[PDB]
Amino acid sequence: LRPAKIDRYVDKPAYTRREYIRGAPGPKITIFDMGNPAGDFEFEVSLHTAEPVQIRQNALEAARQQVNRYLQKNVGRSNYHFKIRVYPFQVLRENPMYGNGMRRPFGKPIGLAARLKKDQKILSIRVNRQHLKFAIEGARRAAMKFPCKCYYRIYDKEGNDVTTKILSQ
Amino acid sequence: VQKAHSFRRKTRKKLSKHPRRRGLPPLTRFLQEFEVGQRVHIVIEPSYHKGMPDPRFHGRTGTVVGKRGEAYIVEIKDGSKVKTLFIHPVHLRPQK
RNA sequence: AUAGGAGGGUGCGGCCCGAAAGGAAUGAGCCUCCCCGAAGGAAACCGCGGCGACGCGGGAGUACGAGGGGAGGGGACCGG
RNA sequence: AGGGAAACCGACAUGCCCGCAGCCGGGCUUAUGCCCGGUGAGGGGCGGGGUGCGAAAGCGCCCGGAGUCACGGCCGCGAG
RNA sequence: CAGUUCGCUCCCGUGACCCCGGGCUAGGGGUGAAAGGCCAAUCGAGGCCGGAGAUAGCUGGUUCCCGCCGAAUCAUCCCGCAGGAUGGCCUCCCCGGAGGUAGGCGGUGGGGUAGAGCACUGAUUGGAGGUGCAGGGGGCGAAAGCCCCCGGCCUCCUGUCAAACUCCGAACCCACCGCCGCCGUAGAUGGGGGGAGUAGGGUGGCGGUGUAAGCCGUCCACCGAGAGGGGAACAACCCAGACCGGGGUUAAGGCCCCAAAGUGCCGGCUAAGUGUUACUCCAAAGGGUGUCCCGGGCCUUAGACAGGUCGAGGUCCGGGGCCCCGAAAAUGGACGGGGCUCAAGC
RNA sequence: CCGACACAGGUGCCCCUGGGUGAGAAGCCUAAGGCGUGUCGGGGGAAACCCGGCCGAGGGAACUCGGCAAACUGGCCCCG
RNA sequence: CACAGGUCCCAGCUAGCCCGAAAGGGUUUGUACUGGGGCCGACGCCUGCCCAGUGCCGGUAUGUGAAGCCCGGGUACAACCGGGUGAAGCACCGGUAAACGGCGGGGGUAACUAUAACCCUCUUAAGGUAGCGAAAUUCCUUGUCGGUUAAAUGCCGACCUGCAUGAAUGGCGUAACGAGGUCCCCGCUGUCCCCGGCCGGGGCCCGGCGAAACCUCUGCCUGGCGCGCAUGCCAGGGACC
RNA sequence: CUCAGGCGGGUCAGGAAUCCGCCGUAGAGUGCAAGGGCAAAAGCCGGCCUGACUGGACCCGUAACAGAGGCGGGUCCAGCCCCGAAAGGGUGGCCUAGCGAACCCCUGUGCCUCCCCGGUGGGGGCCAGGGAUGACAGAAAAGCUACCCUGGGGAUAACAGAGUCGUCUCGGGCGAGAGCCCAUAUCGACCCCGAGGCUUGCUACCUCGCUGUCGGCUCUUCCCAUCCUGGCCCUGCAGCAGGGGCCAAGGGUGGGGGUGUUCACCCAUUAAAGGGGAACGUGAGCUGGGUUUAGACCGUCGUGAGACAGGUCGGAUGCUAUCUACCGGGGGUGUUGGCCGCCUGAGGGGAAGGUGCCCCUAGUACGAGAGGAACAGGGUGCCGCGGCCUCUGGUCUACCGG
RNA sequence: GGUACGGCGGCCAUAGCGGGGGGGCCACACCCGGUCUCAUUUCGAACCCGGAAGUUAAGCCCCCCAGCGAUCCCGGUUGUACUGCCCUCCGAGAGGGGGCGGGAAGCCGGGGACGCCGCCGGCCA
């Protein structure tokens, strides 16, 4: 696994058309909804990036496992809904290099990543009042796994920002 | 890889019609007439394949200097050279 | 014989040479005084504004100013 | 005197239009000069003509006289 | 001493032994117990003179001064890729005689990039409803077929995409016309002729590619082919494009000393020598009751917090400015140097 | 004599050799014969260092790619 | 490399092989116990299979096969066209490997455990026999085991999994021989621990003869800029000749 | 005339044979890729035909602007025709690919021509079609060089420098967990952010009118990411020891076996037997074992010459120091007149010192036992440095003896 | 000049899809029958020929709507996203920012929209 700083930035054009990309790998993350999506919840904690960035599927899966384990241990399966809103479409390639360097250097697919704009939500955890601290801790744990600065916000059912109200209360 | 210019090279969007304009065009453009010295725009109609000039000249404004058969003789200034084209009136539009 | 840059460039100072071919006793460097003057251009002092550095009106487009002319003194250098 | 591979054939000493310089007439301007209208060499464009290809139309080349010789110079090609 | 010698050590030393005089074998030839060895200091084809001043797209050189104008390394073709040809760009001369268009305004047309979106094409999380739908799994029946789960296919909701998607769509660019502006009878636009050089470009912004450096194009601004004044020195960065002798004022930027110009002024911040860096050079994720501030909630001047008693503001959160930790390299030393703390830093 | 030389090479050591020791035309000394011209001299605890040579306590290859170099043995007689 | 020894090939003489433009010639004042042409290389024991390929030799019934000749057409004559005859050489057939070369590859077993070839299936011209083998041939490799040392990428012995050994481009062994490469033992020693003395010649000074290589001009440093490792540039440091 | 697909209904007949109805913007088809275009058609089904023809003109593209042989395409005039009632269309395929100079040759056609003239056979010329050059704007065409030679090239590789850090070395953020409970005594998954230039790679910026390679020996110096020595903190630290971390670069970090080796492995000691930079420090200091010429052998590959980042034996190391640099040794000037003697010490240099072991504390603290410290106090070895010749040893070309 | 009449057209969805009500002087249709003209790869179903027994059920004509599709205007998101020129403005980088000039797409709310226009003829007057 090469360092994520290589694929962190978004200066390259979008590379997603599976009809023309030869040898594109299959996704490594297959679960995007956990908990009880049907049940309603008063509050939702969303995680946003502070800058445009490509987040790898490995980082997405690691954050998913960590947050899901924490929420299962502390809150309970029927008391939360954890969702990842983004899907890895960008295909990350690498130059395949006896041996010729820089000759015919177009890369072959090696992984997948999700490209995100500025202030775009990555994941959401829907909980009630009594599990807000656990939701915030899970959001922080997820943010610790990503290659960019991230911040959390709290929204009510109507969609208004109430993070300051909730944290002060 | 260098690619030589052809008649239909890189004309995917230039020579494509609107979905609501598919089919035969109205006959006014087909039957329109011009006088010598009149200035006309070149708007190629993709459905009509007769008397079509090179798509490189699509969108340019020329002057009518004659008429041969059913096609009009249009003069354009490509750089400093004078270029003569035989364009069907369906591919032409009057200026103003 | 306490001083650093390819050995030169600009300006001048110290020492030295300076008959002819350059100027010059029909007057040299030098000293004093008077007139005009482009672009530019102060200050003393008075009045006022600003927390302050400071600025504004008068003085004043004055003193001065590249250069262009004139008069007096002295008597051998100036250019190189 | 050109056209054509060849046989071979064989053309405006100006019919017309536009028009610069020059010339002529008029108006303004102190003058220079500007404007309007004619005539306009050279210049441009038609019309007509010789020939080759064509059944023909039609196209290519050519047609209303400027060439030739010398001195000097630049350049291309071959010779070291 | 010597264009292969000297010393010590070593080997053969009656044999296929060593040496001398007279002869023969001559250059694609001789000779070779075969190393391409030897053939007069020369041998994978000797030497001398001649062809001959051979040829090269490769290396080097090319001699006085002033004046005017002043490039290019980009397209097509070549057994073409260190070389040529046709064009583009430069220069000199002439014909012709009234228009021309680098900039702008308005107008008549063209476009599908950025952005955005799911209406086609292809992707994409979960849920609800419909459809037995040729699927599978069980139970279930002699056999005709049922009952569920899952799967497939449609509609809706929910959460996401596209260089080789577009129901939309800029900035902007291009063609033409009228006008403003500028150039032109002291002759432009244009046409004819003579002579070239140029076929390695670089920096910078943008695009594709690459971990990056870099590679490949594009834009024509600067170096190339450019002085002077600055960035400490610098090709490219800033001012600025330059005949000669003088005077003055400004430009980049600078004013503690080096070093011309203020230890200049008002308000605030920093205590780390952080900094003293416009750019050619400059370290991050994660943290800090370190300080200076803004906004929003709860209690809230003997009703708050800390330890029913005191008796004045505490409690939390999200942010902004400077600074701190994170922070290890080899000759002795780099804010240009000295040094600088209500600064000579921000 | 040839090699550019009054060249430590090659041509020619091509032919010849008194005494002692000794197997010996070996090494060493010496007679005859020749030379002091294998041609710059003088000084010196006058060094370091280099070339050539002698010796080295205890250990005995631990050196090194490798006992390189050096060192041990050495002639003759008798057993084996 | 040569060598004595082994073996193969051509040749009965106006031969075989070779020089040359030819004339003539070398072998040759020679005659198969000879002349010429390859390969191996004393000596001892041996030298297995393959002629499909490429070479060489013999045959060549048959096909093709140039000129010349003959026949028909054509040309008032020719050029030209068609056919027949048709040598050598190829096609074809046979010998030849001490001629050039080659001598393979998958499954399962005999489970008195497991693992081996007796064994049955494609396959070629045939599938490497006797010997030797981690080799001057072994990539993995410093193979594994044993001996040598306190310690062994060495050396010797053995095993065989021979990447890619092998029988006259010879196989194996071998006394004597060797300034050939290689390992060990006794002895020896300044190779070393660890260097110290002494001698002669240079070096050094004095009197003489008297050059050459080389030389843009010059010539101190640290950190930097720079065509990317500066005596000469920038900022500093130091320095009498 | 209208397709693909779907729905509902039908004898065998079912998922799928043929048929009726409805929805159906093309979701079909159009010879073949893709793009574009096509619905009373350019698609499907039929009728009649050969315009896939002859003689010519102009224009666009390859090849913008801006030059072009050959080729492709478009707009037309005339002739002879085809379909249609007519309008109208037809110079191949709905548009964009499916292809080619000179010379020579073959064919069609109807003209000109061959040296004084005429006839015949034959030849030459003009127009049209065809045979191909795929390196496709058009040579006919296999290799080795390590015996190599020449002209050049930092326009271009290997060593070294430079840029970069994917890789390498070394850290950091979070904490699933493993640890009898306990994430942080210790290890720390999945992810994420870095530093160094000590491994390798990438680029081709300096250097091809030469900057001499690996390893070893000799010698000097520097960094800390510290192996030991000095001082500390946490512990799943009883003691003796261990594990993790902090300050600290004054000193030390050694001897041997195979191998050319660096490295790695092994042996006996030791407090420990650290990693690196200095042109992978150091060949005008050495050696020449490996690598990398010319000789030769083996194996494999090749018909062969020959080749192998495959082994193997042999295979040259030039110097009179010009400047500067360092080590020591001298002559001068200056230091406001000259000379002799004794002093001061601004600055520079040092490691002048470093480190083991033994006795005792003490069989004590600690500990169930086994085992087993420390402060203080004494002694001594080794490495390093500066001196000396009384003792011992070496030499002693003075000297004495055999 | 009137007509809930027709023919030929222009723009080619603000005009289409789907619904509700009304109408036939004339005219347009549905409809009746296949000898003749013409045709079925069968079928007078289409096309064609000859007509007016019946019907306004629908094609057609007139009025209306906003469920779908499309599209014009106004307000919010919003001068948001994006962008031309200059810069000694900040940022480690990514990128951002200041001045002057332009400026969306989508979504939400309220209106619009069930076409407009040209030539001629028929019938009545």
Tab-separated table of N, CA, C and O (backbone and C1' of nucleotides) in Angstrom, chain E residues 277-320:
chain	number	residue	atom	x	y	z
E	277	U	P	14.456	40.389	5.898
E	277	U	O5'	13.818	38.997	5.464
E	277	U	C5'	12.470	38.920	5.016
E	277	U	C4'	12.374	38.322	3.635
E	277	U	C3'	10.953	38.125	3.106
E	277	U	O3'	10.954	38.302	1.691
E	277	U	C1'	12.060	36.051	3.161
E	278	A	P	10.942	39.775	1.051
E	278	A	O5'	9.638	39.789	0.140
E	278	A	C5'	8.373	39.427	0.671
E	278	A	C4'	7.412	39.046	-0.423
E	278	A	C3'	7.778	37.806	-1.222
E	278	A	O3'	7.403	36.602	-0.576
E	278	A	C1'	7.199	39.545	-2.702
E	279	C	P	8.344	35.305	-0.676
E	279	C	O5'	8.473	35.036	-2.240
E	279	C	C5'	7.380	34.533	-2.992
E	279	C	C4'	7.798	34.205	-4.401
E	279	C	C3'	9.005	33.291	-4.527
E	279	C	O3'	8.657	31.926	-4.394
E	279	C	C1'	9.239	35.138	-5.995
E	280	U	P	9.791	30.825	-4.126
E	280	U	O5'	10.436	30.587	-5.561
E	280	U	C5'	11.630	29.837	-5.702
E	280	U	C4'	12.395	30.235	-6.937
E	280	U	C3'	13.869	29.867	-6.945
E	280	U	O3'	14.088	28.522	-7.335
E	280	U	C1'	13.597	32.114	-7.653
E	281	C	P	14.631	27.438	-6.280
E	281	C	O5'	14.117	27.973	-4.872
E	281	C	C5'	13.371	27.133	-4.003
E	281	C	C4'	14.043	26.999	-2.661
E	281	C	C3'	13.118	27.005	-1.454
E	281	C	O3'	12.556	25.731	-1.190
E	281	C	C1'	14.910	28.504	-1.085
E	282	C	P	11.085	25.603	-0.556
E	282	C	O5'	11.246	26.165	0.926
E	282	C	C5'	12.092	25.519	1.872
E	282	C	C4'	12.065	26.219	3.209
E	282	C	C3'	10.804	25.988	4.036
E	282	C	O3'	11.135	26.021	5.421
E	282	C	C1'	11.010	28.289	3.547
E	283	A	P	10.432	24.999	6.440
E	283	A	O5'	9.017	24.700	5.773
E	283	A	C5'	7.847	24.597	6.569
E	283	A	C4'	7.231	23.224	6.473
E	283	A	C3'	6.393	22.792	7.667
E	283	A	O3'	5.066	23.288	7.604
E	283	A	C1'	7.898	21.062	7.086
E	284	A	P	4.110	23.236	8.893
E	284	A	O5'	3.258	21.907	8.687
E	284	A	C5'	2.460	21.726	7.527
E	284	A	C4'	1.956	20.310	7.422
E	284	A	C3'	1.044	19.847	8.549
E	284	A	O3'	-0.305	20.225	8.342
E	284	A	C1'	2.733	18.234	8.186
E	285	A	P	-1.312	20.387	9.583
E	285	A	O5'	-1.748	18.895	9.924
E	285	A	C5'	-2.491	18.116	8.998
E	285	A	C4'	-2.617	16.689	9.464
E	285	A	C3'	-3.220	16.503	10.848
E	285	A	O3'	-4.637	16.493	10.823
E	285	A	C1'	-1.229	15.238	10.677
E	286	G	P	-5.480	17.434	11.811
E	286	G	O5'	-5.136	16.880	13.262
E	286	G	C5'	-5.364	15.520	13.596
E	286	G	C4'	-4.575	15.119	14.814
E	286	G	C3'	-4.829	15.943	16.063
E	286	G	O3'	-6.004	15.554	16.750
E	286	G	C1'	-2.505	15.705	15.747
E	287	G	P	-6.768	16.606	17.690
E	287	G	O5'	-5.790	16.773	18.932
E	287	G	C5'	-5.846	17.922	19.760
E	287	G	C4'	-4.613	18.032	20.619
E	287	G	C3'	-4.501	19.289	21.460
E	287	G	O3'	-5.264	19.232	22.651
E	287	G	C1'	-2.464	18.925	20.346
E	288	G	P	-6.064	20.530	23.150
E	288	G	O5'	-4.923	21.491	23.709
E	288	G	C5'	-4.025	21.046	24.713
E	288	G	C4'	-3.062	22.134	25.114
E	288	G	C3'	-3.679	23.483	25.434
E	288	G	O3'	-4.204	23.538	26.747
E	288	G	C1'	-1.786	23.778	24.042
E	289	U	P	-5.791	23.598	26.991
E	289	U	O5'	-5.917	23.814	28.562
E	289	U	C5'	-6.977	24.586	29.114
E	289	U	C4'	-6.561	26.020	29.327
E	289	U	C3'	-5.188	26.209	29.966
E	289	U	O3'	-4.584	27.393	29.445
E	289	U	C1'	-6.840	27.182	31.347
E	290	G	P	-3.296	27.290	28.490
E	290	G	O5'	-2.220	28.232	29.190
E	290	G	C5'	-0.830	28.029	28.987
E	290	G	C4'	-0.150	29.296	28.537
E	290	G	C3'	-1.032	30.532	28.487
E	290	G	O3'	-1.169	31.148	29.755
E	290	G	C1'	0.210	30.363	26.482
E	291	U	P	-2.278	32.281	29.991
E	291	U	O5'	-1.604	33.598	29.405
E	291	U	C5'	-2.391	34.733	29.094
E	291	U	C4'	-1.918	35.404	27.831
E	291	U	C3'	-2.956	36.250	27.116
E	291	U	O3'	-3.101	37.537	27.687
E	291	U	C1'	-1.875	34.852	25.553
E	292	C	P	-4.562	38.112	28.022
E	292	C	O5'	-5.015	38.809	26.666
E	292	C	C5'	-4.261	39.875	26.113
E	292	C	C4'	-4.758	40.241	24.738
E	292	C	C3'	-6.266	40.349	24.591
E	292	C	O3'	-6.762	41.599	25.030
E	292	C	C1'	-5.377	39.084	22.800
E	293	C	P	-8.321	41.777	25.363
E	293	C	O5'	-9.027	41.663	23.943
E	293	C	C5'	-10.336	41.130	23.821
E	293	C	C4'	-10.684	40.850	22.381
E	293	C	C3'	-12.097	40.353	22.135
E	293	C	O3'	-13.041	41.407	22.093
E	293	C	C1'	-10.568	38.991	20.959
E	294	C	P	-14.548	41.161	22.582
E	294	C	O5'	-15.209	40.362	21.375
E	294	C	C5'	-15.316	40.955	20.091
E	294	C	C4'	-15.879	39.990	19.080
E	294	C	C3'	-17.191	39.322	19.451
E	294	C	O3'	-18.319	40.158	19.278
E	294	C	C1'	-15.711	37.703	18.610
E	295	G	P	-19.569	40.025	20.277
E	295	G	O5'	-20.246	38.646	19.859
E	295	G	C5'	-20.787	38.468	18.560
E	295	G	C4'	-21.259	37.054	18.337
E	295	G	C3'	-22.209	36.487	19.376
E	295	G	O3'	-23.543	36.925	19.205
E	295	G	C1'	-20.546	34.888	18.871
E	296	G	P	-24.539	36.976	20.462
E	296	G	O5'	-24.916	35.449	20.716
E	296	G	C5'	-25.546	34.680	19.703
E	296	G	C4'	-25.478	33.202	19.996
E	296	G	C3'	-26.130	32.739	21.287
E	296	G	O3'	-27.536	32.625	21.181
E	296	G	C1'	-24.017	31.708	21.055
E	297	G	P	-28.461	32.827	22.477
E	297	G	O5'	-28.272	31.476	23.299
E	297	G	C5'	-28.679	31.391	24.656
E	297	G	C4'	-28.525	29.992	25.197
E	297	G	C3'	-28.516	29.873	26.711
E	297	G	O3'	-29.804	29.988	27.319
E	297	G	C1'	-26.691	28.670	25.839
E	298	C	P	-30.851	28.769	27.412
E	298	C	O5'	-30.393	27.985	28.721
E	298	C	C5'	-30.439	28.627	29.985
E	298	C	C4'	-29.643	27.894	31.034
E	298	C	C3'	-29.467	28.642	32.346
E	298	C	O3'	-30.585	28.500	33.204
E	298	C	C1'	-27.377	27.796	31.638
E	299	C	P	-31.330	29.801	33.779
E	299	C	O5'	-30.607	30.068	35.172
E	299	C	C5'	-30.588	29.070	36.180
E	299	C	C4'	-29.318	29.122	36.988
E	299	C	C3'	-29.053	30.417	37.739
E	299	C	O3'	-29.774	30.509	38.956
E	299	C	C1'	-27.081	29.719	36.637
E	300	U	P	-30.002	31.939	39.656
E	300	U	O5'	-28.531	32.438	40.018
E	300	U	C5'	-28.266	33.812	40.257
E	300	U	C4'	-27.045	34.283	39.509
E	300	U	C3'	-27.064	35.738	39.065
E	300	U	O3'	-26.691	36.643	40.089
E	300	U	C1'	-26.429	34.382	37.246
E	301	U	P	-26.979	38.215	39.914
E	301	U	O5'	-26.684	38.823	41.355
E	301	U	C5'	-26.270	37.985	42.430
E	301	U	C4'	-25.279	38.675	43.336
E	301	U	C3'	-25.708	40.044	43.857
E	301	U	O3'	-25.182	40.227	45.172
E	301	U	C1'	-23.704	40.261	42.626
E	302	A	P	-25.931	39.587	46.441
E	302	A	O5'	-24.890	38.521	47.005
E	302	A	C5'	-25.127	37.125	46.879
E	302	A	C4'	-25.524	36.521	48.203
E	302	A	C3'	-26.960	36.776	48.638
E	302	A	O3'	-27.898	35.876	48.064
E	302	A	C1'	-25.498	37.309	50.415
E	303	G	P	-27.507	34.342	47.765
E	303	G	O5'	-28.909	33.624	47.533
E	303	G	C5'	-29.005	32.208	47.476
E	303	G	C4'	-29.434	31.743	46.107
E	303	G	C3'	-28.340	31.707	45.049
E	303	G	O3'	-27.586	30.505	45.088
E	303	G	C1'	-30.229	32.844	44.192
E	304	A	P	-25.994	30.537	45.315
E	304	A	O5'	-25.391	30.509	43.840
E	304	A	C5'	-25.966	29.686	42.837
E	304	A	C4'	-25.245	29.824	41.518
E	304	A	C3'	-23.924	29.083	41.395
E	304	A	O3'	-24.088	27.708	41.092
E	304	A	C1'	-23.658	31.292	40.608
E	305	C	P	-23.332	26.589	41.963
E	305	C	O5'	-21.802	26.728	41.537
E	305	C	C5'	-21.346	26.234	40.286
E	305	C	C4'	-19.853	26.390	40.138
E	305	C	C3'	-19.000	25.776	41.239
E	305	C	O3'	-18.808	24.381	41.089
E	305	C	C1'	-18.240	27.963	40.790
E	306	A	P	-18.515	23.462	42.376
E	306	A	O5'	-17.115	23.988	42.931
E	306	A	C5'	-15.912	23.774	42.205
E	306	A	C4'	-14.728	24.428	42.876
E	306	A	C3'	-14.399	23.942	44.277
E	306	A	O3'	-13.680	22.721	44.281
E	306	A	C1'	-14.336	26.303	44.228
E	307	G	P	-14.108	21.535	45.274
E	307	G	O5'	-13.759	22.099	46.723
E	307	G	C5'	-12.414	22.355	47.101
E	307	G	C4'	-12.327	22.883	48.509
E	307	G	C3'	-13.147	22.137	49.550
E	307	G	O3'	-12.508	20.964	50.020
E	307	G	C1'	-13.500	24.460	49.788
E	308	G	P	-29.179	22.967	54.295
E	308	G	O5'	-27.624	23.175	54.571
E	308	G	C5'	-27.109	23.166	55.899
E	308	G	C4'	-26.081	24.251	56.113
E	308	G	C3'	-26.580	25.677	55.893
E	308	G	O3'	-25.877	26.555	56.770
E	308	G	C1'	-24.817	25.227	54.393
E	309	U	P	-26.635	27.792	57.460
E	309	U	O5'	-25.471	28.843	57.743
E	309	U	C5'	-24.836	29.535	56.678
E	309	U	C4'	-23.348	29.293	56.667
E	309	U	C3'	-22.509	30.317	55.914
E	309	U	O3'	-22.232	31.477	56.683
E	309	U	C1'	-21.837	28.128	55.303
E	310	C	P	-23.047	32.845	56.443
E	310	C	O5'	-22.947	33.099	54.874
E	310	C	C5'	-22.026	34.043	54.344
E	310	C	C4'	-20.620	33.503	54.372
E	310	C	C3'	-19.574	34.284	53.597
E	310	C	O3'	-19.108	35.427	54.293
E	310	C	C1'	-19.339	31.974	53.148
E	311	G	P	-18.558	36.699	53.480
E	311	G	O5'	-18.706	36.274	51.952
E	311	G	C5'	-17.688	36.580	51.005
E	311	G	C4'	-18.255	36.797	49.623
E	311	G	C3'	-18.993	38.118	49.420
E	311	G	O3'	-18.814	38.553	48.073
E	311	G	C1'	-20.479	36.320	49.039
E	312	A	P	-17.586	39.515	47.685
E	312	A	O5'	-17.188	39.051	46.214
E	312	A	C5'	-17.261	39.959	45.120
E	312	A	C4'	-17.186	39.244	43.793
E	312	A	C3'	-17.654	40.061	42.593
E	312	A	O3'	-16.913	39.670	41.439
E	312	A	C1'	-19.012	38.144	42.813
E	313	G	P	-16.589	40.740	40.285
E	313	G	O5'	-17.496	40.270	39.064
E	313	G	C5'	-17.034	39.282	38.155
E	313	G	C4'	-17.389	37.892	38.622
E	313	G	C3'	-16.920	36.754	37.730
E	313	G	O3'	-15.563	36.413	37.950
E	313	G	C1'	-19.183	36.414	38.321
E	314	G	P	-14.876	35.243	37.093
E	314	G	O5'	-15.354	33.907	37.816
E	314	G	C5'	-15.242	32.654	37.163
E	314	G	C4'	-16.358	31.716	37.548
E	314	G	C3'	-16.472	30.467	36.691
E	314	G	O3'	-15.583	29.455	37.127
E	314	G	C1'	-18.618	31.446	36.991
E	315	U	P	-15.243	28.210	36.179
E	315	U	O5'	-16.571	27.334	36.222
E	315	U	C5'	-16.808	26.344	35.239
E	315	U	C4'	-18.268	26.244	34.888
E	315	U	C3'	-18.573	25.655	33.521
E	315	U	O3'	-18.523	24.239	33.519
E	315	U	C1'	-19.880	27.601	33.864
E	316	C	P	-17.176	23.470	33.095
E	316	C	O5'	-17.491	22.935	31.633
E	316	C	C5'	-17.229	23.744	30.498
E	316	C	C4'	-18.316	23.611	29.466
E	316	C	C3'	-17.871	23.779	28.025
E	316	C	O3'	-17.304	22.596	27.492
E	316	C	C1'	-19.807	25.075	28.405
E	317	C	P	-16.121	22.681	26.411
E	317	C	O5'	-16.874	23.042	25.057
E	317	C	C5'	-17.986	22.275	24.622
E	317	C	C4'	-18.790	23.011	23.582
E	317	C	C3'	-18.003	23.569	22.413
E	317	C	O3'	-17.704	22.581	21.445
E	317	C	C1'	-19.530	25.198	23.200
E	318	G	P	-16.301	22.611	20.669
E	318	G	O5'	-16.590	23.553	19.422
E	318	G	C5'	-17.736	23.342	18.611
E	318	G	C4'	-18.082	24.575	17.821
E	318	G	C3'	-16.922	25.254	17.115
E	318	G	O3'	-16.568	24.619	15.901
E	318	G	C1'	-18.204	26.877	18.245
E	319	G	P	-15.103	24.836	15.285
E	319	G	O5'	-15.157	26.317	14.708
E	319	G	C5'	-13.988	27.116	14.636
E	319	G	C4'	-14.331	28.579	14.525
E	319	G	C3'	-13.152	29.520	14.369
E	319	G	O3'	-12.676	29.582	13.038
E	319	G	C1'	-14.615	30.362	16.019
E	320	G	P	-11.100	29.518	12.744
E	320	G	O5'	-10.624	31.024	12.933
E	320	G	C5'	-11.245	32.071	12.205
E	320	G	C4'	-10.842	33.428	12.723
E	320	G	C3'	-9.360	33.642	12.968
E	320	G	O3'	-8.626	33.887	11.783
E	320	G	C1'	-10.592	34.495	14.790
